[PDB]
Amino acid sequence: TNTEFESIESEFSEIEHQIGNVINWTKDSITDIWTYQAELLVAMENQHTIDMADSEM
């Protein structure tokens, strides 16, 4: 469901402190969902593959 993403902060200039923190908070809080979501999601695919293949025998 690809959606293009832009830049919301400058990599060479500076940002205001008040708004920079809010941007920082959201990013670190959104990176914590993908990391947690990916670990468990894969573990539930490794788990099923082992069980599935052993029933075929």
Partner 1 sequence: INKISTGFTYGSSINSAGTTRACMRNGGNSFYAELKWLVSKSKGQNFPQTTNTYRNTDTAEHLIMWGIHHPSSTQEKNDLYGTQSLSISVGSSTYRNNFVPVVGARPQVNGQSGRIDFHWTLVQPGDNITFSHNGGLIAPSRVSKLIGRGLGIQSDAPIDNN
Ligand X SMILES: *[C@@H]1O[C@H](CO)[C@@H](O[C@@H]2O[C@H](CO)[C@@H](O[C@@H]3O[C@H](CO)[C@@H](O)[C@H](O)[C@@H]3O)[C@H](O)[C@H]2NC(C)=O)[C@H](O)[C@H]1NC(C)=O
Residues that bind partner 1 (CB under 8 A): 4, 6-7, 10-12
The minimum distance between CB 47 and ligand X, in angstroms, equals 35
Q: Which of 2, 10, 13, 17 binds ligand X (CB under 6 A)?
A: 17
In angstroms, rounded to a whole number, what is the distance separating the alpha carbons of residues 17 and 24?
10
In angstroms, rounded to a whole number, what is the distance separating the alpha carbons of residues 39 and 35?
6
Residue 20 interacts with, from ligand X, partner 1, none (CB under 5-8 Å by kind): ligand X
In angstroms, rounded to a whole number, what is the distance separating the alpha carbons of residues 20 and 10?
11
Q: By C-beta, is 13 or 46 nearer to ligand X?
A: 13
